[PDB]
Structure formats: structure tokens, C-alpha cells
Amino acid sequence: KKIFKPEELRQALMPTLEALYRQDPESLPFRQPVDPQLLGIPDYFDIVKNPMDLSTIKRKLDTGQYQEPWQYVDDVWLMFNNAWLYNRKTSRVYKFCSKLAEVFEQEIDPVMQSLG
Ligand SMILES: CO[C@H]1CC[C@@H](n2c([C@@H]3CCCC(=O)N3c3ccccc3)nc3cc(-c4c(C)noc4C)ccc32)CC1
């Protein structure tokens, strides 16, 4: 299938990550990995087996760790689904997660079409 290369992926995908970072305050819980010790939620890693956050995804884009666009998309939805799994539907963080998902879905669709 189509072979991609890192700089092509970073230039195409990074604006979609940038759109998530620009959401203030909705992206604030997601700009750094969850620290369950500081936040007093010691069961976090009992529930969330593969943590993900914007800073990790950004580093992976920056350092060429995605061979295909769908791997980037996978990590974004993984970050969203970790937050939806751990938090109550009525919580601020759950709602901010859904806001980021709405933004992502608008940003990623034209990009993935253009990478196809
Ligand atoms: C800059 O560093 C800050 C340090 C930690 C702060 N934080 C908070 C605080 C608690 C206090 C009440 C509040 O309103 N907060 C907040 C809510 C939205 C916007 C800004 C502040 N609750 C958090 C929940 C998760 C999380 C996720 C994601 N998935 O599971 C879990 C669990 C992660 C970070 C959280 C966010 C950023």
C-alpha cells in the first residue's frame, strides 16, 4: 500500500494536533500525562492500561514514530477513550474530552481524505 514518510505525516497531521492544543481550557487535562499520584487517584493505572496524552502524541509526530496516518488517529482516539472510561459522564474532564473529539473529527476528516 501507499508508503508515507515522517515529514509528510508531520506536516499533514500536526495542524490537527495544534487545533486540539488551541482549545482552552478544554485541552488542559490532556497536555501532559495523567499523574495518578499527584491527583490522588491511585486506581488510575488499574483501569487505564495504555495511557496517552497530547504531549506524547506530539513527541511521536515530531520524532517520526508514525509510519501511517491511522496510527496517529489511533493514539488520539485512545487518549479520548481513556478519559471517557475513567471519568463520570457528568464530569468536567469527560465533557472537555468530548469537546476535543468534536474538534478532532472536524479537523482530521479533510486531512485523511487528502492523504488517501
Ligand atoms: C495543567 O495541569 C493541570 C493539572 C491536572 C488538572 N486536572 C484536573 C483539575 C482538578 C481540579 C478540578 C479541575 O477543574 N481540574 C481541571 C479540569 C479541566 C481543565 C483544567 C483544570 N482534573 C483532571 C483529570 C484528568 C484525567 C484525565 C484527562 N483522564 O482521567 C483523569 C482523572 C487529568 C488532569 C486533571 C488539569 C491540568
Author numbering: 1082 to 1197
Task: Give the authors' words.
Many proteins, including the EP300/CBP histone acetyltransferases (HATs), contain several targetable domains. EP300 and CBP broadly regulate the activity of other proteins through their protein acetyltransferase catalytic activity. These proteins contain several highly homologous domains, including KIX, bromodomains (BRDs) and HAT domains, through which they interact with, dock to, and acetylate target proteins, respectively. EP300/CBP are critical gene-regulatory targets in cancer, with existing high potency inhibitors of either the catalytic HAT domain or protein-binding bromodomain (BRD). Using crystallography, we identify the binding mechanism of the EP300/CBP-specific BRD inhibitor CCS1477 in complex with the EP300, CBP and BRD4 BRDs, and define components of the CCS1477 catalytic binding core that are required for compound activity.
Since recombinant CBP BRD was more robust in biochemical assays and crystallization studies, Kd values were determined for all compound-CBP interactions by MST, and co-crystal structures of the CBP BRD with five of the seven analogues were determined. Substitution of difluorophenyl with a less bulky phenyl (compound 5) resulted in a ~10-fold loss of binding activity, and the cocrystal revealed that R1173 is now hydrogen-bonded to the piperidinone oxygen but not quite close enough to the phenyl ring to establish a Pi-cation interaction. In contrast, milder changes to compound structure that retain the ability of compound to form Pi-cation as well as hydrogen-bonding interactions with the bromodomain result in only minor changes in IC50.
